Amino acid sequence: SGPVPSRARVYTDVNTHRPREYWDYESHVVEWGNQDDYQLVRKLGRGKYSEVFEAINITNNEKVVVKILKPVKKKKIKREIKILENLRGGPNIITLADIVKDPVSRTPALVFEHVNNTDFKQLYQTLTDYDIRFYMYEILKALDYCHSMGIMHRDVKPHNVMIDHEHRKLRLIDWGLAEFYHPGQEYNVRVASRYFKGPELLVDYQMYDYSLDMWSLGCMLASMIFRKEPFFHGHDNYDQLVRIAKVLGTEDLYDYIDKYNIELDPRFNDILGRHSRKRWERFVHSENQHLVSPEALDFLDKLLRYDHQSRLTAREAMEHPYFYTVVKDQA
Numbered sequence: 483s484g485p486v487p488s489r490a491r492v493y494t495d496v497n498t499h500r501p502r503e504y505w506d507y508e509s510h511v512v513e514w515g516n517q518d519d520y521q522l523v524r525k526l527g528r529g530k531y532s533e534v535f536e537a538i539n540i541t542n543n544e545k546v547v548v549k550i551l552k553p554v555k556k557k558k559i560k561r562e563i564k565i566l567e568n569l570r571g572g573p574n575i576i577t578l579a580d581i582v583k584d585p586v587s588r589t590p591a592l593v594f595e596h597v598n599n600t601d602f603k604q605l606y607q608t609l610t611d612y613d614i615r616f617y618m619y620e621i622l623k624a625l626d627y628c629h630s631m632g633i634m635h636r637d638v639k640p641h642n643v644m645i646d647h648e649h650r651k652l653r654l655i656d657w658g659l660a661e662f663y664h665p666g667q668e669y670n671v672r673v674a675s676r677y678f679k680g681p682e683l684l685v686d687y688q689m690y691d692y693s694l695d696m697w698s699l700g701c702m703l704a705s706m707i708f709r710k711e712p713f714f715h716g717h718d719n720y721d722q723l724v725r726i727a728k729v730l731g732t733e734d735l736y737d738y739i740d741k742y743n744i745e746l747d748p749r750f751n752d753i754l755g756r757h758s759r760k761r762w763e764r765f766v767h768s769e770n771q772h773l774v775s776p777e778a779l780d781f782l783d784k785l786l787r788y789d790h791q792s793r794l795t796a797r798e799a800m801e802h803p804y805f806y807t808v809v810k811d812q813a
């Protein structure tokens with residue numbers, strides 16, 4: 483009879499202090515550009531809700547990326563657009579450049595700045611220890627910004643990070659799952675990719691916040707420093723929690739569940755079992771050691787907690803000793 487409520491420990495009331503129209507995205511009327519300014523060059527991808535193309539803007543010969551949407555509810559498009567507009571100009575956030583509709587096909591299309599992304603297949607296997615720190619820092623810039631701006635991404639994962647390694651340039655993309663944080667709001671748990679889902683999603687706690695992003699970020703980091711993609715390799719949503727439980731241990735899981743008075747889907751009773759909390763050494767090997775340091779491990783531990791309220795904030799993370807060499811070097 484009742485899960486215990488949660489609020490975010492930071493940036494809690496940011497949207498409340500803004501005018502309505504900032505977060506009330508169903509109000510948003512869309513500014514349409516001229517679709518004849520863009521010619522499609524080649525397909526790049528086929529996401530869940532979109533097909534993605536490289537294009538040229540013929541007015542200025544600018545290279546651009548075009549996301550043509552499949553049928554989605556207008557208020558979700560208004561949501562994606564509103565968040566992009568609110569965040570435009572923020573550090574390492576992708577820039578929305580324009581919005582167009584095919585006059586006949588009535589299909590909306592988002593137009594983005596092009597990033598010359600070297601492929602995350604082969605990039606991630608040439609990344610030095612310093613490289614990872616630098617790019618982890620650059621993602622945290624984006625996350626602290628969007629959080630301070632009342633937004634949670636909700637789909638942080640390698641595919642949604644664009645890196646031009648030649649120009650040491652990073653952009654957090656795909657804001658189509660992002661939502662505004664409002665104290666006491668119960669969100670949809672059917673979000674994020676399986677391997678990147680935090681416990682709150684898996685146990686069905688809806689009153690989550692920005693700290694979801696910090697779990698996902700931990701997942702990314704783990705896979706990068708231990709060179710194990712994906713780090714938590716679940717067979718389905720249920721088993722994903724088990725993979726977490728096999729590392730973080732069942733004791734803290736049940737403490738988390740008590741505190742928030744969560745009702746576990748009675749299925750979980752079977753397969754969760756009892757499991758100790760493992761040390762990170764069980765994942766350190768000769769081919770990864772050159773990426774793992776005590777400071778990296780300390781950092782990771784403080785991202786990957788069941789209790790969303792005890793995970794580092796983006797700002798806290800940025801102050802971690804893991805990034806001292808990076809922070810000092812960025813002068």
Ligand SMILES: N#Cc1cnn2c(NC3CC3)cc(Nc3cccc(-n4cnnc4)c3)nc12
Nearest residue numbers: 526527529534547594595596597598599655656
């Ligand atoms: N935004 C952006 C951007 C910017 N650059 N870029 C590149 N650059 C190509 C490698 C040169 C690829 C690329 N690919 C891609 C593939 C599937 C889905 C999405 N997506 C989903 N939601 N928004 C976007 C994007 N996206 C981008």
